[PDB]
A paper describes a structure:
We have focused our work on the iron(II)/α-KetoAcid-dependent Oxygenases (αKAOs), a mechanistically diverse superfamily of enzymes that use dioxygen as the oxidant to catalyze several reactions via C-H bond activation, mostly hydroxylation. These enzymes operate with three substrates, dioxygen, α-ketoglutarate (α-KG) and a primary substrate. One of these, KDO1, catalyzes the formation of (3S)-3-hydroxy-L-lysine, while five others, KDO2 to KDO6, promote the formation of (4R)-4-hydroxy-L-lysine. We based our analysis on the structures that we solved by X-ray crystallography of two of the regiodivergent αKAOs active towards L-lysine, namely KDO1 from Catenulispora acidiphila, that catalyzes the C-3 hydroxylation, and KDO5, from Flavobacterium sp., that catalyzes the C-4 hydroxylation.
In KDO1, the L-lysine complex shows a well ordered lysine in monomer C. The interacting residues are Glu180, Arg332, Asp 234, Asp 268 (salt bridges 2.9 Å; 3.0 Å and 3.0 Å; 2.9 Å; 2.7 Å), Ser168 and Ser236 (H-bonds 3.2 Å and 3.3 Å; 3.3 Å). The Nε is restrained at the bottom of the pocket by two salt bridges with the Oδ2 of Asp268 and the Oδ1 of Asp234, while in KDO5 the Nε is stabilized via a water molecule in interaction with Asp260. The size of the KDO1 pocket is smaller than that of KDO5 due to Ser168 (instead of Gly). For KDO1, the adjacent loop has a direct impact on positioning the substrate in the active site as Ser168 (P6 in the logo) makes a H-bond with the carboxylate group of the lysine. In the closed form, the lysine or hydroxy-lysine/succinate are covered by the adjacent loop and the active site is locked by interactions between Thr167 (P5) and Ser236 (P14). In the absence of the α-KG, unlike what is observed for the lysine-KDO1 complexes, the lysine is positioned differently in the four molecules of lysine-KDO5, suggesting that this substrate is not properly stabilized.
Numbering used by the authors: 34 to 358
Write the structure that this text describes.
Amino acid sequence: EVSAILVLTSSEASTLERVADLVTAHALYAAHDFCAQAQLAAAELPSRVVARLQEFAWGDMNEGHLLIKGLPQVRSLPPTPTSNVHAVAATTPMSRYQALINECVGRMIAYEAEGHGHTFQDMVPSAMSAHSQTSLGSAVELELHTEQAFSPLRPDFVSLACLRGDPRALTYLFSARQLVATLTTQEIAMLREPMWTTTVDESFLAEGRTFLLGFERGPIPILSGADDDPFIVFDQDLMRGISAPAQELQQTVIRAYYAERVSHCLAPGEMLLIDNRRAVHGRSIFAPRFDGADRFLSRSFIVADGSRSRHARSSFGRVVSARFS
Ligand SMILES: N[C@@H](CCCC[NH3+])C(=O)O
Ligand SMILES: N[C@@H](CCCC[NH3+])C(=O)O
Ligand SMILES: [Cl-]
Ligand SMILES: [Fe+2]
């Protein structure tokens, strides 16, 4: 279903593989040096690839996402971890290919409250949180959402590199432009009004953790920005309308999503960039085995402007402190 596709040629993938050798710093323990090295090395990538990523990063009339095919094959992948605490993806050659493409688009960032602030987070099924609304779920559909809908420091892009896929695990994508095309002028206007409260994601909460902005946030609008290139903040599960029409309108958005969403099954060697301002995403049910061969994605986050989170970070740090989310 996915429209915006970048297919790397054999020669382009070989250049990416060679350029990755310029990124030598430890992704977890020297995250800033690692990301700065990727940003500099990204200048050595094929110009056709860099041009595509820069136009996607600018954002104007982009499709809400970019699917990249043809990344070099990951040859000695360790078993899929049964939890996200290990940060296994951050060691692989794919993580350096992911950083190179990411740093073309913008600045990599991590959040202390999400996957322990790991530069790359392991997106693997959990047996305990199989029926939960998190990146580690599987038995239930991961409902429609903006990544960190509750946070003003939410990423500009979500980067997903596939290490192991699952044929039943579909990624759903739905743009703010697809939404607006199905709505009336009145519905678009109400969506632009501050009528919905949000709460902090389950994955962000912890014992003794206090957020400067609280647990409950808003009311905020769902839509914003230009009429022809709208921005979206949505959370199917956690948004609550402040009025009866606002609640009905949240259901209208969900219905438009089920009717118009595009799907894609992430496969090894593929990378998906989601524009977190222009598109919302979801994930179907799948049946993991927890045998070490399950679906395994490497997730990272990108921001255009590192100065917006400077108050929340340490000097030469890539991690936003939990209380600032
Ligand atoms: N972004 C969440 C999943 C969506 C939850 C939406 N309230 C996670 O990584 O766990
Ligand atoms: N359970 C903690 C309090 C932490 C705050 C609630 N998450 C205690 O030892 O009193
Ligand atoms: Cl930010
Ligand atoms: Fe998510």
